C-alpha cells in the first residue's frame, strides 16, 4: 500500500509513502498509518492532525472544505496532508483502492427494506455455499463467513469485506441500511446484484412527501453500481420502480406479476404451509418446480423467493436450486421448526415485543391444522408497558396462552404474569404455569399431533435470568428433549 499509487486516479502528484492501515480514529491511529480526517456530525478530524502527527502517522487525507483546493498537497513536520472535496462522499472508493477492490474479488449481494434483510441474507449466503461458494454475512448479527459469524463507516465495510476476501469468501450477502446508504457507506461497493424486500417507512401519505423521498432514494440508486435489480412486486413501492426498470427481476406470491412486460419474473402459483414448513409451487422466465422450505409463514416464502430470484438472476442454474432448497434452514430461534413423528408442531421464536409476537402467531396460525398454544413471558426489571399487550395478543392470536416467566431479575414473578393477565378480556382462559421449563412441557405434552406450539421470547438465548443468576436454561434444548430429537 503506497500513498502515490492510492492517489493516482484523482491526485497525479502525490508523494510515494508505504501505509500500514487505514483510520478515522486519531486515538489509535499508529505509527506507518494513513490517517483520514473527515467533518460530519458536529465533529472536525482536522482538528486531530497534530495528535496523528504526533503519533507518527506516515501521511493524512484530509477535508479541504474551506482549508484548502482539492488535490492541494501540503507537508507538516515532513509528514504529506492531502486534502479532497467532499471526502465524505469518496471515503468509500478511496477504502475501496486502499484494501485492493474486494467487492471485485468475489460475488457481493446487497439487500436492503424494512423487514426480511437479516433472512434473506443468510438464505442467499447458505445456497450459494451448496452450490458451492464460500459464502460470508454482513449484517446486524454480525460479519464472518457462514457459521463463524462475530458480533460503522466506509473505510470499516471496505475493510471487513477486504478481510472476508482474505478468509477465502467467493461470495457476500450484505444487508444495506436506508441509513448507510444515504451516509454513502456502500458507495463505491461493485453490486453484483441488489435485493429490495419491503418498505413499511410510514410519514409518506402526502404525495410531495412520498416525491421527495421516492426522488431521494433514486438519486442514490442512480449513482451505486447495483448490478441485476431484484424487486419484491408485492410491495406498492416495489411495483412503481419495477415500472421503471425493465432489466430488474419482479417477485411476487401475491399475483402482481405483469406478463406483458416480457420482464424476467418469479411467482409462487401455490403454497401449502404444513406442520414441517412450506411447498411452494412457482413459475419464472428461468422455468417452473417445486421448493420444499423448512421455513415457517408467509414472509419466510418472500424471503426464499427473492433469494431464488437473486440467485438465478446471477446464472445459478434453476436444477442445482431446486437440489439444495430442502437444506436451507432458519436463522437460529427464529421461526425455528422442531418436528417429530406423532407430537405437536413446535415453533421456537424470539418475538419479545407485540408486533412480533403477533406475526410469529400469524406465521405459526398458516402451518396449524389444530390449535396454536403460545408459551411466553416477559422480562422483569424493564419497561412494564408491552406486558397487558403481549397478553392481548396472546388471548386473540392463540387457542391456548400459556404465561410462564422470561427473566423475571430481581422482580415478583408472579407480579409479571398479572400484568399480562391484565390485559386479557378472559384471563381466566390464559393457563399459568411457572417454571418456565414446566410451562413449556404442559404445552408440547397436552397439545393434539395436529396443534401447533410457540415457544416465544427466547429464541437462540441459552440462559433465564432469575435474580442475580444466569441459569444454563434453553428453549431449544427444552423442546428437542420432550419431542425426542437434538437442539
Known amino acids: ?209 412520498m416525491e421527495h423521498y421516492e426522488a431521494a432514494k433514486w438519486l442514490l440508486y442512480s449513482e451505486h453500481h447495483c448490478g441485476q435489480a431484484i424487486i419484491n412486486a408485492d410491495d406498492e413501492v416495489g411495483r412503481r420502480w419495477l415500472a421503471k426498470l425493465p432489466d430488474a427481476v419482479a417477485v411476487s406470491m401475491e399475483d402482481h406479476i405483469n406478463p406483458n412486460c416480457h420482464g424476467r419474473w418469479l411467482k409462487a402459483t401455490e403454497v401449502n404451509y404444513h406442520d414441517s414448513g412450506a411447498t411452494i409451487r412457482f413459475s419464472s422466465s428461468w422455468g417452473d418446480g417445486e421448493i420444499e422450505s423448512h421455513l415457517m409463514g408467509a414472509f419466510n416464502v418472500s424471503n426464499l423467493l427473492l433469494a431464488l430470484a437473486t440467485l438465478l438472476a446471477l446464472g445459478y442454474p434453476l436444477a442445482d436450486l431446486l437440489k439444495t432448497a430442502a437444506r436451507l434452514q432458519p436463522v437460529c430461534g427464529r421461526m425455528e421448526v422442531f418436528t417429530a413423528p406423532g407430537k405437536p408442531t413446535v415453533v421456537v421464536d424470539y418475538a419479545h415485543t407485540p408486533d412480533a409476537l403477533e406475526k410469529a402467531l400469524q406465521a405459526a396460525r398458516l402451518h396449524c391444522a389444530g390449535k396454536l398454544w403460545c408459551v411466553f413471558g416477559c422480562g422483569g426489571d424493564r419497561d412494564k408497558g408491552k406486558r397487558p399487550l403481549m397478553g392481548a395478543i396472546a388471548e386473540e392470536f392463540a387457542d391456548v396462552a400459556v404465561v410462564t416467566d422470561d427473566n423475571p431479575r430481581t422482580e415478583e414473578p408472579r407480579a409479571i404474569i398479572n400484568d399480562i393477565l391484565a390485559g386479557m378480556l378472559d384471563a381466566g382462559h390464559a393457563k399459568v404455569m411457572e417454571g418456565r421449563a414446566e410451562a413449556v412441557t404442559c404445552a408440547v405434552m397436552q397439545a393434539k399431533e395436529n396443534d401447533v406450539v410457540l415457544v416465544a421470547g427466547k429464541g437462540h438465548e441459552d440462559y433465564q435470568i432469575v435474580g442475580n443468576q444466569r441459569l444454563d436454561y434453553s428453549d431449544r434444548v427444552t423442546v428437542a428433549r420432550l419431542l425426542g430429537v437434538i437442539a
Open 1 to 209: 500500500r503506497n500513498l502515490r499509487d492510492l492517489l493516482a486516479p484523482w491526485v497525479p502528484d502525490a508523494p510515494s509513502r508505504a501505509l500500514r492501515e487505514m483510520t478515522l480514529d486519531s486515538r489509535v491511529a499508529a505509527a506507518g498509518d494513513l490517517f483520514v480526517a473527515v467533518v460530519g456530525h458536529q465533529a472536525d478530524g482536522r482538528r486531530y492532525i497534530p495528535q496523528a502527527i504526533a503519533q507518527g502517522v506516515a501521511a493524512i487525507i484530509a477535508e479541504a472544505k474551506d482549508e484548502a483546493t482539492d488535490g492541494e498537497i501540503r507537508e507538516m513536520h515532513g509528514v504529506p496532508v492531502i486534502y479532497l472535496s467532499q471526502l465524505n462522499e469518496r471515503l468509500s472508493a478511496l477504502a475501496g483502492r486502499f484494501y485492493h477492490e474486494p467487492s471485485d474479488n468475489l460475488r457481493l449481494v446487497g439487500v436492503t427494506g424494512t423487514n426480511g434483510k437479516t433472512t434473506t441474507t443468510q438464505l442467499l449466503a447458505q445456497w450459494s455455499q451448496l452450490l458451492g461458494e464460500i459464502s460470508a454475512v454482513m449484517g446486524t448479527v454480525g460479519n464472518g463467513l457462514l457459521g463463524k459469524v462475530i458480533p460503522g463507516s466506509a473505510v470499516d465495510v471496505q475493510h471487513e469485506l477486504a478481510g472476508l476476501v482474505d478468509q477465502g469468501a467467493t461470495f457476500c450477502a450484505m444487508e444495506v441500511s436506508s441509513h448507510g446508504l444515504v451516509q454513502h457507506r456502500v458507495a463505491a461497493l461493485k453490486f453484483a446484484a441488489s435485493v429490495f424486500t419491503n418498505l413499511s417507512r410510514d410519514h409518506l401519505d402526502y404525495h410531495g412527501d
